């Protein structure tokens, strides 16, 4: 069976994700590589009206105390569902075409983001910003789809100073320049990388839970649990009077561990020119995991899906 | 070589049984070879959020009274439905690795109060019909329905509407309001659900029959697909956007492999209990995946019950 390389470009926004990605796709021909781009048309029109605007306006009104935490949370939670929808459907239709893990791939499929972006990372940051409850974050976590083999994810690294500068120059429609949110999202993605490494080094969150109080994967020693996503969830809302997590929330963390531990995570250094990033990413794809497809007709089906997606939801 | 499991999801529109109905189900769970995962009312009222059911019904009421907009109501219903479904989704996700292929009496029978689709598809679709949820949100929930594992036996209820109104009025839940429009909506959705499974199982192709919505199995107009001929979901030329069409493809895949069973609730609580046992002889069993799966399952269900059930 012909092979597939799937690569999800993810991480915080504002780093040069898109430019880098497009430059890589520009190196292929057409039958070689396809791009599933950012679904901005879904976000601005198809799913709801100006979802990014709504998110940033809501956080703003919260900060100013014009609306309550509960009011912000219902909006943020609903908004995140709309944000996540294209990633989620794409995963569900792709799933039956993906075979076991597997020399040049017949097809390279590059994604602008993975479902965890909208189900885990942005919600966890909004929780840090006080505009989402931890119960809602964990509900999203429980809904993360099963991790398909050959799930390669690229996260970004960039100094905070350079990040703040780059971000100010590429605000999206409706976006406001919230540096607290930038700090939150950078922190969440740092924790994410540590979490994957922690799990792959044999970390068991239940064993280390009691060590809690008060970045890179695919390399390095095992992180402390306090430096992983698990640390976010020792919140009073989630704790029984006897002090431990309610089991329902503990089960969500079990799901978080299962989903992340089989992912192949890489870190791209964005602190360089657009061409530099492209070639960095290219080099990085050499150590990435390919899968077989399920049928021989899977390949063109996949190209059709990607192009259809791009035409309808891409800018 | 692995032990066998029978999973049974008791679902359908709420308010059809009797309070003495569930006791027998708890009673049935009294055996060591049957566990009964109960309704997670404590999660809804306290753990996930405060009085989620009250929040839901008050919101519809205020919308009905003109005190809030359709948009205001939608964001509330959407985020509330996340809270409602969380216990089902976490449970499904931790159970998933333990379920093998299809398979005498089973080593263990697991009876759930509701399946994930109740909170991801059915109540959301009913709220869409009540004008308090966008169809895009409903299809986003649909897209997140976990893959249908082998042996997914869903029990749906049959009860004439008037008798249903009677029973429902006599056991309102905390924060609930007796809304006849919602009863009709939720009854309609579940009816369409049952039709939708038969449609799919008889080889119905929604993409093939789609045009019939504007011009031996149910007519597509009598399936859930008819709800998503919603104008929000269509391009200026009337075509369904592909993103929503893919969500319908998912809907089809999830629903087709479910095994539906109809339980007549128009009888005594003991009669209902007996009927449920009668139904089990046709339900699909599976192997589990490890020798430790069975006790792990019992533990999950008992812990769920103790923590989140009443
Ligand atoms: C994916 C995602 C994003 C990221 C975007 C582009 O990276 C959209 F602005 N943002 C900014 C959110 O607020 N929530 C999300 O789920
Ligand atoms: C499962 C579910 C229910 C059903 C309940 C009892 O079956 C809670 F009252 N209700 C009433 C909703 O509004 N949403 C849901 O997701």
């Amino acid at each position: 069976m012909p092979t597939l390389l799937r690569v999800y470009i993810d991480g915080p926004h504002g780093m040069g994700k898109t430019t880098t990605t497009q430059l890589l796709v520009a190196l292929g021909s057409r039958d070689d590589i396809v791009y599933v781009p950012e679904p901005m048309t879904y976000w601005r029109v198809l799913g709801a009206s100006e979802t990014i605007a709504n998110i940033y306006t809501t956080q703003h009104r919260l900060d100013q105390g014009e609306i309550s935490a509960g009011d912000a949370a219902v909006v943020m939670t609903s908004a995140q569902i709309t944000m996540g929808m294209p990633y989620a459907v794409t995963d569900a239709v792709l799933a039956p075409h993906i075979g076991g893990e597997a020399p040049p791939p017949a097809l390279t499929l590059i994604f602008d983001r993975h479902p965890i972006a909208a189900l885990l990372c942005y919600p966890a940051a909004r929780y840090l910003m006080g505009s989402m409850t931890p119960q809602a974050v964990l509900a999203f976590v429980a809904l993360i789809p099963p991790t398909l083999p050959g799930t390669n994810i690229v996260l970004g690294a960039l100094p905070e100073d350079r990040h703040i500068d780059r971000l100010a120059k590429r605000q999206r429609p409706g976006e406001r320049l919230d540096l607290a949110m930038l700090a939150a999202i950078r922190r969440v993605y740092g924790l994410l990388a540590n979490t994957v490494r922690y799990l792959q080094c044999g970390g068991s969150w239940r064993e280390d839970w009691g060590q809690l109080s008060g970045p890179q994967s695919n390399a390095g020693p095992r992180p402390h649990i306090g430096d992983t996503l698990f640390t976010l969830f020792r919140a009073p809302e989630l704790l029984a009077p006897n002090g431990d997590l309610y089991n329902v929330f503990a089960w969500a963390l079990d799901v978080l561990a299962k989903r992340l531990r089989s992912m192949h995570v890489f870190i791209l250094d964005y602190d360089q020119s657009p061409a530099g990033c492209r070639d960095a990413l290219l080099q990085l794809t050499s150590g990435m995991v390919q899968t077989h497809v399920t049928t021989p007709g899977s390949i063109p089906t996949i190209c059709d899906l990607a192009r259809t997606f791009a035409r309808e939801m891409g800018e």
Side-chain angles (χ1 to χ4, degrees), chain A residues 1-29 32-161 163-168 170-310 312-315:
Chain A
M1 282 286 180
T3 59
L4 178 68
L5 178 68
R6 279 166 31 256
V7 188
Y8 299 85
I9 315 301
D10 208 286
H13 67 287
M15 290 184 302
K17 234 174 64 54
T18 312
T19 298
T20 300
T21 298
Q22 289 270 46
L23 284 172
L24 178 60
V25 175
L27 292 186
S29 283
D32 297 326
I33 181 179
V34 206
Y35 184 23
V36 176
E38 178 171 289
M40 280 237 53
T41 299
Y42 191 79
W43 297 339
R44 293 189 65 187
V45 176
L46 307 182
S49 179
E50 308 287 359
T51 304
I52 289 174
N54 190 30
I55 289 168
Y56 282 85
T57 293
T58 302
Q59 185 71 52
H60 178 78
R61 290 181 184 167
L62 177 62
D63 297 350
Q64 299 304 315
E66 303 178 29
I67 64 175
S68 68
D71 296 341
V74 307
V75 170
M76 285 297 186
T77 303
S78 297
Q80 280 302 132
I81 291 284
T82 309
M83 295 296 287
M85 193 280 194
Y87 307 143
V89 286
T90 298
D91 189 87
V93 303
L94 225 72
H97 289 283
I98 311 307
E101 291 177 352
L107 181 63
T108 293
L109 180 60
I110 310 287
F111 297 81
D112 196 321
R113 300 189 175 286
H114 187 276
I116 63 176
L119 288 168
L120 162 72
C121 299
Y122 283 85
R126 287 299 166 187
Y127 160 69
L128 291 187
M129 296 289 96
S131 50
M132 171 132 322
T133 74
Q135 296 100 310
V137 174
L138 281 184
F140 282 173
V141 162
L143 295 165
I144 293 168
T147 306
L148 296 155
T151 300
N152 304 288
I153 307 204
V154 177
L155 305 180
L158 190 65
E160 184 184 63
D161 273 325
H163 198 170
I164 290 163
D165 291 345
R166 279 190 188 176
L167 182 53
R170 35 242 215 181
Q171 296 287 291
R172 279 167 167 82
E175 191 171 355
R176 302 183 193 215
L177 193 56
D178 185 337
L179 306 186
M181 178 60 190
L182 176 60
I185 200 66
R186 284 174 58 86
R187 176 181 191 222
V188 165
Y189 275 101
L191 296 173
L192 169 62
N194 290 341
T195 307
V196 177
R197 184 53 178 187
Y198 173 86
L199 294 171
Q200 297 184 153
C201 292
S204 166
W205 78 265
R206 284 169 180 278
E207 282 191 338
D208 299 337
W209 181 253
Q211 301 177 339
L212 290 179
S213 277
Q216 53 173 342
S217 173
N218 74 324
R222 176 161 67 100
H224 187 292
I225 182 170
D227 295 322
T228 75
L229 290 164
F230 294 114
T231 201
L232 300 186
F233 303 106
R234 53 159 218 295
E237 298 92 343
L238 312 182
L239 302 184
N242 64 75
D244 295 280
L245 280 172
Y246 286 105
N247 291 286
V248 61
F249 301 127
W251 294 329
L253 294 182
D254 288 338
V255 171
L256 180 68
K258 166 95 172 199
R259 296 295 182 260
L260 298 184
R261 75 190 187 190
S262 71
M263 286 177 182
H264 306 290
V265 182
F266 304 89
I267 308 279
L268 183 55
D269 186 354
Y270 285 96
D271 200 11
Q272 56 190 325
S273 71
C277 292
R278 178 201 67 205
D279 295 343
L281 174 56
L282 191 57
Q283 189 277 324
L284 222 44
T285 67
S286 66
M288 290 189 182
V289 175
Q290 305 175 10
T291 70
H292 293 283
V293 291
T294 283
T295 72
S298 289
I299 301 293
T301 300
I302 294 174
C303 290
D304 172 80
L305 177 285
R307 295 159 181 167
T308 295
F309 187 111
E312 179 173 281
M313 286 178 280
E315 291 141 50

